[PDB]
Amino acid sequence: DPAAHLPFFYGSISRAEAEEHLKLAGMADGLFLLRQCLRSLGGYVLSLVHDVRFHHFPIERQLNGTYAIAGGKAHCGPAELCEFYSRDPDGLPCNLRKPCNRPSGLEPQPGVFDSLRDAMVRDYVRQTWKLEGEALEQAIISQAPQVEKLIATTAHERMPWYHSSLTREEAERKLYSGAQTDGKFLLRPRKEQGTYALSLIYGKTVYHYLISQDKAGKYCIPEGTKFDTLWQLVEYLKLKADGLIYCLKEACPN
């Protein structure tokens, strides 16, 4: 990871434990850390403390391999960006004054998605070109440019909760027929091609949330958080409530 070497990079930690580290580190103005963005690919999040309050600024990776906060200047890397903002707040509540370094012995938190992608890539090369051992590991180095991006976008397509060709009625039928537990959900595509539907049960009723993607390629529910992939979308709404009546929990059969 371009940020692994940075001592204030915490990897894929949630906002909650991110704020716990900033709290343990003194909550001084300009106290900051870096963590992986769970909504975008190759993106980061700048967690910042000002006036004893937490400020979280998404850093999304541009098409040309640079990094930028929305409506802010671009930088060649996380190292550069933090170096820049250390001397010019240029939008932030204040400059980055003191890095919230990882405790001794603690390394960046490995991400769920990145490990899933790693296994899917290795699985693709395995069944396609019939390779094993180091001969497979070497093939993954060269055969991970486009497919790495393709497997990420299509990760949901291989997931249990994803249903290939179900209408609203077909979904509601077996949804009830089961444990009827809260949070039991599923995902499915729709007629408008670039849209999907998130169906789940909560207490009494089957709810349905319209998912649409705006070009730039980012999926979202109207007036909701935007994701780069449907997999990240579903995984985000498992822990964070984020608008839903009830966060996702369990899945339906394949």
Binding site: G72, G91, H208, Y209, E223, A241, D242, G243, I245
Partner: peptide, 17 residues
């Protein structure tokens, strides 16, 4: 008949000026 999101419980991120 799609359900509107609760605009009051969306997770909010900060932005520049």
């Amino acid at each position: 008949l799609y359900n509107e999101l609760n605009l009051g419980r969306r997770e909010e991120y900060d932005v520049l000026d």
